[PDB]
Amino acid sequence: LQNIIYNPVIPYVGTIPDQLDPGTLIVICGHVPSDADRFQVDLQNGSSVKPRADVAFHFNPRFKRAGCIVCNTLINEKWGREEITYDTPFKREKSFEIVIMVLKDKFQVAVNGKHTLLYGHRIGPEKIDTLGIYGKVNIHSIGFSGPSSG
Ligand SMILES: OC[C@H]1O[C@@H](O[C@H]2[C@H](O)[C@@H](O)[C@H](O)O[C@@H]2CO)[C@H](O)[C@@H](O)[C@H]1O
């Protein structure tokens, strides 16, 4: 991988190395803390806190009850329609590997080598230049792979 970040402190907010052109991969390896309630991975347009930066893609695994993954987009500080995935591969006290592939019309996400969900772009991905990770989660590494990697 390229531009790897190891054991980052959460909350984590860092500029992404390259434009997320179709085919780009975002690999995030971590572990879910005991009794974690939730955590999130946000692909943002900037790092402004106020006004809060738009979130092109909000990937938010929730663990209470049966557990799920909520995906949404924040525009001008307003959340849009939630897209919920009820078949979540995340579990407390277990490690994980998240692979987000940026396609032309959507994001494709796989966890632990298994397809998990799709999310159509609401904001042009070229507007994303910042990665944010918040919540109860331990991140081991963050890596990026461009479309022409090899
Ligand atoms: O949509 C992502 C956004 O959800 C907020 O919580 C929502 C909740 O998921 C929804 O079921 C309820 O109707 O409205 C709540 C907001 O008022 C989270 O608080 C926010 O951090 C994001 O995760």
UniProtKB/TrEMBL annotation:
<protein>
    <recommendedName>
        <fullName>Galectin</fullName>
    </recommendedName>
</protein>
<feature type="domain" description="Galectin">
    <location>
        <begin position="12"/>
        <end position="144"/>
    </location>
</feature>
<comment type="function">
    <text>Beta-galactoside-binding lectin that acts as a sensor of membrane damage caused by infection and restricts the proliferation of infecting pathogens by targeting them for autophagy. Detects membrane rupture by binding beta-galactoside ligands located on the lumenal side of the endosome membrane; these ligands becoming exposed to the cytoplasm following rupture. Restricts infection by initiating autophagy via interaction with CALCOCO2/NDP52. Required to restrict infection of bacterial invasion such as S.typhimurium. Also required to restrict infection of Picornaviridae viruses.</text>
</comment>
